[PDB]
RNA sequence: ACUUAAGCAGUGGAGCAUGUUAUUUAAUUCGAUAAUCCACGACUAACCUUACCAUAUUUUGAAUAUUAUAAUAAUUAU
RNA sequence: CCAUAUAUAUAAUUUUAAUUAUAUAUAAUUUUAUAUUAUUUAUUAAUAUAAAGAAAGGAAUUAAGACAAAUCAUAAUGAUCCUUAUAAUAUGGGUAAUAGACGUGCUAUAAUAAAAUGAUAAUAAAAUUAUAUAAAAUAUAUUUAAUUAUAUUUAAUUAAUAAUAUAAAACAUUUUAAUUUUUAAUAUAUUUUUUUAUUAUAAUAUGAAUUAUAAUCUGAAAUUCGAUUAUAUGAAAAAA
């Protein structure tokens, strides 16, 4: 309290030289606190989940001998096939 | 117009639904974007620096799309889509937090 | 019901299909998915068929992933159902799960994990 | 291996509560806490390395070593790049 | 922004076309402030139904030009 | 025997906040309606969320499959 | 099964909280003895009195009927409808409008009650911190300092370690309108922080809505429409 601030002034200042930090008396906005904010982008990009997964039709490729069968594909498939022999098919869509 | 997005961007593997893709693509767009938009907002918000300049990142910040903004990202539920009550311990809303717990797929979480 | 000896109880750990600890969270969200994923997967690859009329449909149980320091085990239960001389759907089935050189399933899903 | 090991120290329980609207979940995390004592850097990655290779489902592991010793920028690369495009550079 | 040291909120728009050929400027940008050198121009601000016609006063500066395109119906 | 009744402890005429309803609105996203009463979810609505309105714009779109083309790697005999 | 009480183990008692932590086990759904009441006559029950006990709480766990529910956001299937649009994207707007009516909550309407102050720092628990957290210091509001709010700078800690965070009521002193129940001038006293005498001496120093001005915070952006601070403003609210 009694000690001048020009002596603390000169300490915080060799510091701050010392330890790599930024020396700010005037107290100006510097943006520093931009610059040492950590980047989220990753983890907020990896939020659903890794895209690059084996997917069903990846299987034809990979184990050809193997002929899997897609059982939701097949019932859609024959709804709609069911769908289009009662008239109740969806129409043809426009076409530039 | 065949993709809904201006960029080019993978599915999330799991449930999808219009919402999810609009949240996703804006996810991949701030991880695109990040240190472009940090850079600006450090140029607007530096005393040190012109006017003219933080003016200049400024209108460089407003002029960005709506896809590289961190607060436009909004947590859904990975599993239904929905966006009220998602606990983000598994990024589950509640109703699907419960199932799963129920189901033992989420590790450590029992019964209370 | 003895707890202290491991055949007279069922450990705890068993009943969570996830079977992990990572000091990570954002890890291990991202590893519960993918075990959730992956079982999805899974279940699709249990129907085979050799022709039409020769539908043969494997039932498995819900996968058991225990998550280990340096590996992940996906344990499963299933129900199927001269024949020295040929592999049937199944047998391509389980081989092409582990023992595969070129594109098994367990190198793909290293890579996934 | 010759390692002075203390012995598995109890740590707290964490505890993670979940409220559903009443329905309660909870999380326990469990933590054990063996230290090593009078041991060669070396003889200790062994540890690590044998521990590791036979380690349980479910249990995971921080490891922090004490190595005693004697006494002897992505946004800022980019705010360089941008102060040197057309657009700032005019302005200044 | 709204703390003054961050300085105004400037946004791009068709000003140079509106000082050279006296033509109204077209804005959906509502958040923007007007700033000086706005008098005088006529702006059209969209209301989210609308482009409400204002020119600007020296009264308008520092004040955002959503301020005199109301969105609402009184009653 | 839920309920009532009694006793105890409160809260309760205002302002604000937050809901619902009515009216209004381009929109005020959605919720009740067989006569006691009662349309009433928010672990966060500035943009997002969003479901609604106005104005522009996209048209096999996020999927799976078929059939062609144009490349790119692997293999035959070019 | 929690909790509670106890035992063993573990911790080189500086990750300290050993008054702790968390594994395992034990304990009780308590038991005994008389006396009086009743009794289906005791080897019963209740009450009381003695004796031993730490022992006094809580949760879960199955089916069957009835009715309701499409934010059934507790799904699936099916039917039906739209397919240049009832699908999809962007910009802005709305969900925040205001005559009413009602539900819920918060702040009040003052003296068994509000305010201020209380640094070798009265006294907690349970949580959180890699999509953070923010210490101490410095600067401004601002006034010796403190308090409070921001800014500058980011120390430590990704945690039984460091930080959020010196818990707050409590308690003590002082103050407090209505209240001439007060203040002040003189005397006065063996009440002196006080007594006595003579003189003068319905909305407040409650409440904090609303509004004005200037700042700040987050965010690309605070206009419709956010939060905070300072200087002003100072409404309604008293009875049943
Ligand atoms: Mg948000
Ligand atoms: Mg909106
Ligand atoms: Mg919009
Ligand atoms: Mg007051």
Redesign the interface.
Same mark, same amino acid.
């Given at each position: 309290m009694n000690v001048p601030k020009a002596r603390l002034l000169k300490v915080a200042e060799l510091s701050a030289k010392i330890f790599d930090q930024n020396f700010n008396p005037s107290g100006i906005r510097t943006g520093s606190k931009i610059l040492n904010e950590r980047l989220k982008g990753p983890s907020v990009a990896s939020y659903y989940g890794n895209p690059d997964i084996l997917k069903f039709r990846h299987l034809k490729t990979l184990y050809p001998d193997i002929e899997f069968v897609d059982l939701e594909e097949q019932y859609r498939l024959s709804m709609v096939e069911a769908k289009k022999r009662r008239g109740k098919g969806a129409p043809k869509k426009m076409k530039k | 117009g065949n993709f809904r997005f201006p960029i080019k961007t993978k599915l999330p593997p799991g449930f999808i639904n219009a919402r999810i893709l609009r949240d996703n693509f804006k996810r991949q767009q701030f991880k695109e974007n990040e240190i472009l938009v940090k850079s600006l907002k450090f140029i607007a918000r530096n005393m040190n620096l012109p006017t003219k300049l933080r003016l200049e990142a400024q209108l460089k910040l407003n002029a960005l799309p709506n896809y590289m903004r961190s607060t436009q990202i909004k947590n859904r539920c990975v599993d239904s889509g929905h966006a009220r009550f998602v606990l983000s311990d598994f990024r589950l809303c509640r109703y699907q937090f419960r199932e799963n717990a129920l189901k033992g797929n989420l590790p450590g979480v029992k019964k209370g | 019901g003895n707890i202290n000896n491991k055949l007279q109880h069922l450990n705890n750990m068993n009943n969570w299909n996830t079977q992990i600890y990572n000091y990570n969270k954002n890890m291990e969200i991202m590893n519960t998915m993918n075990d959730k994923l992956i079982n999805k997967l899974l279940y699709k690859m249990m129907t085979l068929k050799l022709n039409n009329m020769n539908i043969n449909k494997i039932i498995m149980s819900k996968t058991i992933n225990q998550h280990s320091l340096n590996k992940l085990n996906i344990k499963f239960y299933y129900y199927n159902n001269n024949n020295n001389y040929y592999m049937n759907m199944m047998n391509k089935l389980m081989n092409i799960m582990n023992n595969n050189m070129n594109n098994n399933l367990c190198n793909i899903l290293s890579y996934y994990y | 291996l010759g390692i002075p090991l203390t012995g598995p120290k109890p740590l707290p329980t964490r505890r993670e509560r979940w409220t559903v609207i009443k329905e309660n979940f909870e999380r326990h995390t469990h933590k054990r806490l063996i230290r090593a004592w009078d041991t060669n850097p070396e003889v200790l990655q062994m540890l690590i390395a044998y521990i590791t290779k036979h380690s349980m489902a479910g249990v995971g592991m921080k490891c922090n070593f004490f190595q005693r010793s004697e006494i002897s920028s992505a946004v800022g690369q980019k705010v360089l790049e941008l102060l040197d495009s057309p657009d700032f550079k005019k302005h200044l | 922004?709204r703390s003054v040291?961050?300085? #105004?909120?400037?946004? #791009?728009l068709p000003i140079r076309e509106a000082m050279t050929k006296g033509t109204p400027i077209r804005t959906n940008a509502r958040a923007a402030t007007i700033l000086p050198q706005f008098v005088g121009l006529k702006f059209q601000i969209h209301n989210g139904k609308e482009y409400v016609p204002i020119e600007i006063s020296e009264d308008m500066v520092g004040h955002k030009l959503g301020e005199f395109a109301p969105t609402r119906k009184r009653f």
């Open positions: - | - | - | - | 922004s040291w961050k300085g #105004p909120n400037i946004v #791009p």
